[PDB]
CSV table of C-alpha atoms and ligand atoms in Angstrom, one decimal:
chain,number,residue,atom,x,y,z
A,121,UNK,CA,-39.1,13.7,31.8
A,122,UNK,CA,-39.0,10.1,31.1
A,123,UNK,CA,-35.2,9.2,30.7
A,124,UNK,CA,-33.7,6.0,27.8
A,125,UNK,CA,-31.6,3.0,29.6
A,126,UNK,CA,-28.4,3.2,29.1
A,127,UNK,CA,-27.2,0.0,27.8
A,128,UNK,CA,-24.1,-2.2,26.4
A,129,UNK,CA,-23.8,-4.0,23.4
A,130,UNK,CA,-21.2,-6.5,21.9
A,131,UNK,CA,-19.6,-5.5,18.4
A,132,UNK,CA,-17.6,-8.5,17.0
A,133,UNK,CA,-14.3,-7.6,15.6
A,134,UNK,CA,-14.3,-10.8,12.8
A,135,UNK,CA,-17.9,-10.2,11.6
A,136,UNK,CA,-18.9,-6.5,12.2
A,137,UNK,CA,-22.1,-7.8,13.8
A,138,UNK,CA,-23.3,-5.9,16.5
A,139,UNK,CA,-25.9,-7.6,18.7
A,140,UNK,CA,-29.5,-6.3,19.0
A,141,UNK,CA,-29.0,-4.1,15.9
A,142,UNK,CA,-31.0,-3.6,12.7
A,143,UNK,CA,-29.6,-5.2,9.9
A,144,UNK,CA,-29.9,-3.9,5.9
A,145,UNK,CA,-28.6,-5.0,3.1
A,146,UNK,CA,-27.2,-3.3,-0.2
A,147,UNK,CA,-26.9,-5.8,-3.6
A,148,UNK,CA,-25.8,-4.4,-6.3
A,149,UNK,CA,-29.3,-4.2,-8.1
A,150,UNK,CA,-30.1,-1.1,-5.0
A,151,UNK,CA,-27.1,0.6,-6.4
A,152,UNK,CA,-28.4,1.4,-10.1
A,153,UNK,CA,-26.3,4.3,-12.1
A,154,UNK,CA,-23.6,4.5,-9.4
A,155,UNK,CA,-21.1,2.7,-11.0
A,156,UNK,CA,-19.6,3.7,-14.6
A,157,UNK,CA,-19.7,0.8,-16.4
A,158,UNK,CA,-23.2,0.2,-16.4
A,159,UNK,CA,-23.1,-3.0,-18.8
A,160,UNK,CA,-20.7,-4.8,-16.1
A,161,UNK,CA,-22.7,-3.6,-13.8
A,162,UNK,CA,-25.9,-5.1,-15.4
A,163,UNK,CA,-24.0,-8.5,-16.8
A,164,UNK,CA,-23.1,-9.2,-12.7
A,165,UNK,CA,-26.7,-8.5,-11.7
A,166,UNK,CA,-27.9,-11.2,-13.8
A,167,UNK,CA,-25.5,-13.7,-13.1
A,168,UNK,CA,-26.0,-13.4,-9.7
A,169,UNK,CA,-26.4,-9.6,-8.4
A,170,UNK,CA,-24.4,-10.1,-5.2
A,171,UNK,CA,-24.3,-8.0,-1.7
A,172,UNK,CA,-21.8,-5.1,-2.4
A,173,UNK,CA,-22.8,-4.3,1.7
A,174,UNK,CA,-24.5,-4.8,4.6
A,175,UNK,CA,-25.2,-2.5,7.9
A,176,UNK,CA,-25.7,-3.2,11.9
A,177,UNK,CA,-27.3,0.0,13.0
A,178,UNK,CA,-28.4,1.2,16.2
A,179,UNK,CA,-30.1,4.4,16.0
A,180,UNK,CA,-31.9,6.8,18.3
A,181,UNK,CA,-34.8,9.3,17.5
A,182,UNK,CA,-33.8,12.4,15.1
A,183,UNK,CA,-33.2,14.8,18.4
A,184,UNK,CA,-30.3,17.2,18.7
A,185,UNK,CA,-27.4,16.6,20.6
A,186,UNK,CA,-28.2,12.0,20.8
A,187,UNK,CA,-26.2,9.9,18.8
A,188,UNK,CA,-26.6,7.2,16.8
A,189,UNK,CA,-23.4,4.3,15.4
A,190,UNK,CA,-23.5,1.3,12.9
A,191,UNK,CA,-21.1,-1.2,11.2
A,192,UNK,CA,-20.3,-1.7,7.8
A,193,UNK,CA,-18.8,-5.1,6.2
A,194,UNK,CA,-18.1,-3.6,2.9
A,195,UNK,CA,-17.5,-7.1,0.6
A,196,UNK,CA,-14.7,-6.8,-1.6
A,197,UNK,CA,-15.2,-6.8,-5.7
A,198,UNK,CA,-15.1,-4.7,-8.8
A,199,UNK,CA,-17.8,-3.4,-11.2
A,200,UNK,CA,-15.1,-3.9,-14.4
A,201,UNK,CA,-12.5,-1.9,-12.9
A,202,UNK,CA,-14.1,0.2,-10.2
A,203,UNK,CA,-13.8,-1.2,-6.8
A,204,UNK,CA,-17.1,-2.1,-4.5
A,205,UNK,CA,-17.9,1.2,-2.6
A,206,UNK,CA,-20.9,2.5,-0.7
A,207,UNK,CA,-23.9,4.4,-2.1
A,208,UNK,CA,-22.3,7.5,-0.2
A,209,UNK,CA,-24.4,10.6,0.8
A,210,UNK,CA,-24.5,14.1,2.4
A,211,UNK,CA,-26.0,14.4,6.0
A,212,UNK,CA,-29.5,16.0,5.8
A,213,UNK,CA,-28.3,18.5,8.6
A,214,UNK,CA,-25.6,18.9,6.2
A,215,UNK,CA,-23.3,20.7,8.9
A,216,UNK,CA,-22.9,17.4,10.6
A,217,UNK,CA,-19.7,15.4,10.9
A,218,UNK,CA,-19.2,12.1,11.6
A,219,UNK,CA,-16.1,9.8,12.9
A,220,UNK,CA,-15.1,6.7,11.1
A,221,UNK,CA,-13.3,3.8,12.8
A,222,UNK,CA,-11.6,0.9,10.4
A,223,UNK,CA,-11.6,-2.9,11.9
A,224,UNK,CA,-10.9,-5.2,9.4
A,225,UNK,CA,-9.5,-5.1,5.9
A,226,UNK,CA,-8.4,-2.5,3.5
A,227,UNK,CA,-9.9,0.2,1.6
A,228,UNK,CA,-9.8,4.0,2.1
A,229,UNK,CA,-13.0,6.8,2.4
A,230,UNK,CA,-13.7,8.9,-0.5
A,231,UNK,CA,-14.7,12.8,0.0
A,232,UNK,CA,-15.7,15.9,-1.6
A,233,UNK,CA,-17.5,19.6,-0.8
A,234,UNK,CA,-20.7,20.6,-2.1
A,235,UNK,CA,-18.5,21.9,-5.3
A,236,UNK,CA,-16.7,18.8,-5.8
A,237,UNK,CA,-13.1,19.3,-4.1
A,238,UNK,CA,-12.1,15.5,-3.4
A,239,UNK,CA,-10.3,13.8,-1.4
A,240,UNK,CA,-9.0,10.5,-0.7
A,241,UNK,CA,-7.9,8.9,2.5
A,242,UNK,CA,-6.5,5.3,3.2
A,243,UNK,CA,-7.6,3.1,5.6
A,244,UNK,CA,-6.3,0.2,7.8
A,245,UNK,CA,-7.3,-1.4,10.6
A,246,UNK,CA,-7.6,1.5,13.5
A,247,UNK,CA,-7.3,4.0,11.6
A,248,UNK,CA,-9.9,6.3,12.4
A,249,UNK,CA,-11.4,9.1,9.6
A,250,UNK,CA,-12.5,12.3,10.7
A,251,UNK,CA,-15.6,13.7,8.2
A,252,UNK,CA,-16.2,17.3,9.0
A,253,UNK,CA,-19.1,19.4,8.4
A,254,UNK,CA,-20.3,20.0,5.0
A,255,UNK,CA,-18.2,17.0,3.1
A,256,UNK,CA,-19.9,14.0,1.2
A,257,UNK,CA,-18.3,10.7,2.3
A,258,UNK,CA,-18.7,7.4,0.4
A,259,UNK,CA,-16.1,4.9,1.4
A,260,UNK,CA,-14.5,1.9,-1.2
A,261,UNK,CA,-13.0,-1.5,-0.6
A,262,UNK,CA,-9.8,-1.7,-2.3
A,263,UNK,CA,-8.9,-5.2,-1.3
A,264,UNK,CA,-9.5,-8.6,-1.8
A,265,UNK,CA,-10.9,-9.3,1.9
A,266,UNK,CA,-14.3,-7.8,3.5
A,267,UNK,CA,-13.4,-4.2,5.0
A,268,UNK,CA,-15.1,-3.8,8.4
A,269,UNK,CA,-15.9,-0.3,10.0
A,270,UNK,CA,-17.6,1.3,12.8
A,271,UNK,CA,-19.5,4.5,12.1
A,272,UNK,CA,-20.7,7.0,14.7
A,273,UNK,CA,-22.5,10.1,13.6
A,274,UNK,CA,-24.8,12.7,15.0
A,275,UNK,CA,-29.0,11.5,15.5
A,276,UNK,CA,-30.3,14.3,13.5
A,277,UNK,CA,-27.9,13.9,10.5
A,278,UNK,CA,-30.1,12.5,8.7
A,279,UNK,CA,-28.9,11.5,5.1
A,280,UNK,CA,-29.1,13.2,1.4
A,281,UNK,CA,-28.3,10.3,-1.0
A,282,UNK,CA,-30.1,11.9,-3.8
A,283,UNK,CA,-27.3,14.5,-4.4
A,284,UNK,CA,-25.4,11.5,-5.1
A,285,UNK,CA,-27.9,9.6,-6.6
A,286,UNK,CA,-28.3,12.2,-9.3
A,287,UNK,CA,-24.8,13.1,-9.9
A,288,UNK,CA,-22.1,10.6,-8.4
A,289,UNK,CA,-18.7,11.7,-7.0
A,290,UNK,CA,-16.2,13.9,-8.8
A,291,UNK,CA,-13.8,11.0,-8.8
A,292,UNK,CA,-13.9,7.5,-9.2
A,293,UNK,CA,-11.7,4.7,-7.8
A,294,UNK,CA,-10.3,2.3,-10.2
A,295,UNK,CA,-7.9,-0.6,-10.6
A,296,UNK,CA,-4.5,0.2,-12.9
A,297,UNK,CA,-1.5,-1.3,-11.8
A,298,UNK,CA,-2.5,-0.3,-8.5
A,299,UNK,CA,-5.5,2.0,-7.2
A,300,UNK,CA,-6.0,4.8,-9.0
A,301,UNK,CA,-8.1,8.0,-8.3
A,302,UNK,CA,-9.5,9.6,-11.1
A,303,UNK,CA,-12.1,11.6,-12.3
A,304,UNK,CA,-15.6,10.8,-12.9
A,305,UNK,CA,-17.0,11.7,-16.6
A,306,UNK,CA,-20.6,11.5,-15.8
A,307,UNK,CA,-20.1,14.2,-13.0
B,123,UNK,CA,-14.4,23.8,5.0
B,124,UNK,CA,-12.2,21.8,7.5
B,125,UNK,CA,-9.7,19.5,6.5
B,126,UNK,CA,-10.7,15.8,6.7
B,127,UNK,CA,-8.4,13.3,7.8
B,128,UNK,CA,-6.8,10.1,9.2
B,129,UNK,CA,-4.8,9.3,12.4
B,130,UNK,CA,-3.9,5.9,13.5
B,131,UNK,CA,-4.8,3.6,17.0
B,132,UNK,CA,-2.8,1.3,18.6
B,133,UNK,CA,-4.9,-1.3,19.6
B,134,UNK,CA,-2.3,-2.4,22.0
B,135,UNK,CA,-1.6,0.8,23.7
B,136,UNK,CA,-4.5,2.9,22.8
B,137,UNK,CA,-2.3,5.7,22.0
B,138,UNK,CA,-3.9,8.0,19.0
B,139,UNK,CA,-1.3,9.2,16.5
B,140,UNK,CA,-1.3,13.4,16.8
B,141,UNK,CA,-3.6,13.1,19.7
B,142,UNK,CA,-3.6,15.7,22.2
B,143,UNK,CA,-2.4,14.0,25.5
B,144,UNK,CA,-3.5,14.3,29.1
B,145,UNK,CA,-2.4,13.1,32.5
B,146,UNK,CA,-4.6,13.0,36.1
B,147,UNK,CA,-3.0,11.5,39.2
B,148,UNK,CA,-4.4,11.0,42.7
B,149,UNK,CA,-3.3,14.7,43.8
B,150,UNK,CA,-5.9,15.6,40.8
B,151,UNK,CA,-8.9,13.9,42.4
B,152,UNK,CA,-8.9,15.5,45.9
B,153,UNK,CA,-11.9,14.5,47.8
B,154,UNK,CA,-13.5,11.9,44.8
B,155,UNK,CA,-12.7,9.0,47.1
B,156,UNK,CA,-14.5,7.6,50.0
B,157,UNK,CA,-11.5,6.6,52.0
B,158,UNK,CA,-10.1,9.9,52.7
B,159,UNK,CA,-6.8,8.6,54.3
B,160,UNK,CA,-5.7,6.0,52.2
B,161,UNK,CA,-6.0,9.1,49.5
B,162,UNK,CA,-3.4,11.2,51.7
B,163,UNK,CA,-1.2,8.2,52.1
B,164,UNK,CA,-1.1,7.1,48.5
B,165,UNK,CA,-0.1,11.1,47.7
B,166,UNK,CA,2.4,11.4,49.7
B,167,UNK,CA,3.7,7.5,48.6
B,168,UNK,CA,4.1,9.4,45.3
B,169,UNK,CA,0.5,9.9,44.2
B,170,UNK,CA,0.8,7.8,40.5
B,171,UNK,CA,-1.3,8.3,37.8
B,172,UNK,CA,-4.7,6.9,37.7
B,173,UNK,CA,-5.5,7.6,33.7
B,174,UNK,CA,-4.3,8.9,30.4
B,175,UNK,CA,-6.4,10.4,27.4
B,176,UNK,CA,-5.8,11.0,23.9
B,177,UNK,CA,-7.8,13.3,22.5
B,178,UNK,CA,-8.6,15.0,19.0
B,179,UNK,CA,-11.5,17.6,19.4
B,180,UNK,CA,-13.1,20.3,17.3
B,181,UNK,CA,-14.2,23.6,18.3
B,182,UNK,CA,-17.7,23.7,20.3
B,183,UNK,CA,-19.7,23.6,17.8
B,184,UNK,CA,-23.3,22.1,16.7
B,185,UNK,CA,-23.6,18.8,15.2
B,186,UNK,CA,-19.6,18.5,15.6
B,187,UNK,CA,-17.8,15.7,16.8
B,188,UNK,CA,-14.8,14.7,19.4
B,189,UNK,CA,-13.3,11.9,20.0
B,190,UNK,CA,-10.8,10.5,22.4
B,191,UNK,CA,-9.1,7.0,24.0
B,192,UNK,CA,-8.4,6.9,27.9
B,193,UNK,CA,-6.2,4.4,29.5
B,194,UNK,CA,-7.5,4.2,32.8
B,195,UNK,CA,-4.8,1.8,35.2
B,196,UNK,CA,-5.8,-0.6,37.5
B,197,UNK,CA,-5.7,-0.3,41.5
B,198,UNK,CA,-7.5,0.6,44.9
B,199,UNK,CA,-8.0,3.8,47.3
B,200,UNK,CA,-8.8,2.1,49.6
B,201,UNK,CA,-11.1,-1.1,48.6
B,202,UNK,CA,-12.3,1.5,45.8
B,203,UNK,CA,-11.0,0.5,42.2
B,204,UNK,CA,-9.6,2.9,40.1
B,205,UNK,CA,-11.8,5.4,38.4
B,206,UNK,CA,-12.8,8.8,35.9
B,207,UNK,CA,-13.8,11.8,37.6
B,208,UNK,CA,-17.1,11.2,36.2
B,209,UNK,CA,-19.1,14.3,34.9
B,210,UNK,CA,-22.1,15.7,33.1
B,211,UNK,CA,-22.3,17.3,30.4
B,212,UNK,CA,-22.8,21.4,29.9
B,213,UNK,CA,-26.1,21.0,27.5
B,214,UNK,CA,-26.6,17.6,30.0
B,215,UNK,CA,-28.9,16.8,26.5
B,216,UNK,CA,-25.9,15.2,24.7
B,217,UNK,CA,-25.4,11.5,24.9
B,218,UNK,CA,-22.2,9.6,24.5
B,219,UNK,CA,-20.7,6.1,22.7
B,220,UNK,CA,-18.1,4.1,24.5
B,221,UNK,CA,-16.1,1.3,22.9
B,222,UNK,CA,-14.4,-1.2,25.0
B,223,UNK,CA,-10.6,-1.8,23.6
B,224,UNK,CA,-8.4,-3.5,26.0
B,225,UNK,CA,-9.0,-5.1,29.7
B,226,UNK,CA,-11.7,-5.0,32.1
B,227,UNK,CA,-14.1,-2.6,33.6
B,228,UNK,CA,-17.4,-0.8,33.6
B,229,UNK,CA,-19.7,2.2,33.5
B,230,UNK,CA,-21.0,4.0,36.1
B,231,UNK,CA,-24.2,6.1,35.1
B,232,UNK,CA,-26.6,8.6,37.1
B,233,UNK,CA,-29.9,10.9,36.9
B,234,UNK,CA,-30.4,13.7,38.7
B,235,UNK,CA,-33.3,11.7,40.0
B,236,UNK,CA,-30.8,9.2,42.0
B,237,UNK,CA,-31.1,6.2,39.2
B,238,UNK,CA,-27.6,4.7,39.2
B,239,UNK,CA,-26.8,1.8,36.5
B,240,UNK,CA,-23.6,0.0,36.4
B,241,UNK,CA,-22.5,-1.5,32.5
B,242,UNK,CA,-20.0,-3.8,32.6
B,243,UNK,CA,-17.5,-3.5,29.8
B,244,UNK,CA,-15.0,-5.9,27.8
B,245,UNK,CA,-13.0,-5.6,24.5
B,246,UNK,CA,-16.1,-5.1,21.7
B,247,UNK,CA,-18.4,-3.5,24.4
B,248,UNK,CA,-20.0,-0.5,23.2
B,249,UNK,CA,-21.6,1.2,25.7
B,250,UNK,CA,-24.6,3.6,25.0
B,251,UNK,CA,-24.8,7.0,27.3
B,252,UNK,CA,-28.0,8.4,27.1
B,253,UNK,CA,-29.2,12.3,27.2
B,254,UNK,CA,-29.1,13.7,31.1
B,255,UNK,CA,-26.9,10.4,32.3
B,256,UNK,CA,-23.8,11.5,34.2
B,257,UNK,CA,-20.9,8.7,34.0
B,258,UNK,CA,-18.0,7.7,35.2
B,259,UNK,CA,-15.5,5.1,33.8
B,260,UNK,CA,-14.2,2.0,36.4
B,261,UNK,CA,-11.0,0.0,35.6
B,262,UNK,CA,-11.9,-3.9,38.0
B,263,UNK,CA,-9.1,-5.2,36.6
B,264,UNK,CA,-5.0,-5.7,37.1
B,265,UNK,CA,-4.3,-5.1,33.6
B,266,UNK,CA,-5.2,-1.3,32.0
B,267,UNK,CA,-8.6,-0.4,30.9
B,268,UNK,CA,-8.5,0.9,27.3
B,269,UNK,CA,-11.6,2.4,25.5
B,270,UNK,CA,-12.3,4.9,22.9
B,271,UNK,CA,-14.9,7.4,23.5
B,272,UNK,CA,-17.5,10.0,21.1
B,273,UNK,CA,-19.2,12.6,22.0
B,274,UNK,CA,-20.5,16.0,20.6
B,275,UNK,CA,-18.3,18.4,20.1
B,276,UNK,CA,-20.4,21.1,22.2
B,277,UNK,CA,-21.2,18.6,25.1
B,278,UNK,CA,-19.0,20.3,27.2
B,279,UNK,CA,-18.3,19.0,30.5
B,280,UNK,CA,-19.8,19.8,34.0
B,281,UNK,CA,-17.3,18.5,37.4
B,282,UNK,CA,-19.0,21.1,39.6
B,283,UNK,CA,-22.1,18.6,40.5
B,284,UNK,CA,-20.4,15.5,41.0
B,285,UNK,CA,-17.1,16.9,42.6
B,286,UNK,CA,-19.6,18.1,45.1
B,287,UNK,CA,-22.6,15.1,45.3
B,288,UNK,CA,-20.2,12.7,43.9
B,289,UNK,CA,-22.0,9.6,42.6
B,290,UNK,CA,-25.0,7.4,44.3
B,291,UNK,CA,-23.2,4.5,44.1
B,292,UNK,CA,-19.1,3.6,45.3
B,293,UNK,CA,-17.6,0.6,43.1
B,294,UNK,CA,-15.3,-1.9,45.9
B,295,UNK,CA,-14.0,-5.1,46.2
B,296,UNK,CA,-15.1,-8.0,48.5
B,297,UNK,CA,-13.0,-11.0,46.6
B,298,UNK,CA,-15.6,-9.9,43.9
B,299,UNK,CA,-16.6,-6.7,41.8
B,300,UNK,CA,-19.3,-4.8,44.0
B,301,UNK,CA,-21.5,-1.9,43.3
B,302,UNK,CA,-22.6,-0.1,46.4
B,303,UNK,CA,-24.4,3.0,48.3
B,304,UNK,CA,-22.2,5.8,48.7
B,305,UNK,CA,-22.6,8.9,51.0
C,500,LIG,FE1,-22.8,9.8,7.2
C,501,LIG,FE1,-18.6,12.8,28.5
């Protein structure tokens, strides 16, 4: 068979940018009905509906056993009192994990099973999150300065953001005298 | 359902907090080097370490990952820098990420076809392994060669082959970094 070229890349640590990758972009307008306050989150649309994220992602074709990796620069904010976060999703191949590695900033990754057992852990730079099969990840910025990570996850993952989509997260993370995890009415 | 979790790196060090860790000196790599006597000699001078790892892995599993930092120390058997075993994987379909912490050094990848490629690494390198590519890290510096390194969790790992064929290409010194034929 015909084999890929390996190849290097450079990531920079300040921006998250990783050379020769494809770039996306998240305002908060793509993230309709995720956050509970849905009049905040319509008053800051339309005064300016700012970028909540972007992504650098390399990726390979959906093929067992290849993997694919991608930055994040989460911006930091708040939608009334909950904190900017990620749309957040299953994996398609929902048995799939996927390894988290924090760069820049402050913020922590938010979790839960199919049934809605949460968790929350905090992040720093280099601390690196371990996702394991089967858990719904959406990570949150709970700072005042962009929070940079590096994402590596299997090719045939795939995503299932509809899950979420539909009926959120079974917590929410707020601001209260500190950060506070609490949980989600709508779900 | 497994337990999710966080462990910190030192970026300085490499060292991963409730890693499991991992030691191979030169009495470890018997016959991986060209120059056969200055690998005798450095043994029996007190054969030191040539890398470290800290890893965290998961059973071998589908769609699982592992993940893992080495700190490979600099020197020379011979005029031959300091290297990894170098190895392919079990299902040789898995591919691999590599991300450049700390120092100098580069990536040493074959086929079974006899393609060799050499990647050149630095701190923010990420390095992309591709399905069916044995590789092989190479520390070309003075100072330690830190990276952290993904992989599936089923990859496995295959030493047989290249303890045997050993790689196409030897990575020297002539006042300068050089990639050459090996035997
Ligand atoms: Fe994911
Ligand atoms: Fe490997």
């Amino acid at each position: 068979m015909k084999y890929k070229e390996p190849f290097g890349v450079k990531l920079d640590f300040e921006t998250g940018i990783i050379e020769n990758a494809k770039k996306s972009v998240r305002r908060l307008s793509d993230m309709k009905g995720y956050f509970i306050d849905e009049e905040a989150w319509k008053k800051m649309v339309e005064e300016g509906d700012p970028v909540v994220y972007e992504v650098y992602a390399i990726e390979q074709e959906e093929k067992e056993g290849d993997l694919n990796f991608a930055t994040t620069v989460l911006y930091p904010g708040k939608v009334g009192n909950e904190f900017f976060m990620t749309k957040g999703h299953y994996h398609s191949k929902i048995d799939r994990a996927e390894v988290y590695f924090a760069l820049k900033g402050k913020g922590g990754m938010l979790l839960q099973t199919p049934e809605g057992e949460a968790r929350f852990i905090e992040m720093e730079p280099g601390t690196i999150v371990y996702v394991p099969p089967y858990w719904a990840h959406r990570t949150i910025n709970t700072g005042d300065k962009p929070f940079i990570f590096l994402a590596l996850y299997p090719a045939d993952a795939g995503h299932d953001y509809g899950t979420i989509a539909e009926k959120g997260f079974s917590k929410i993370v707020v601001e209260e005298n500190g950060k506070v995890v609490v949980k989600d009415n709508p779900k």
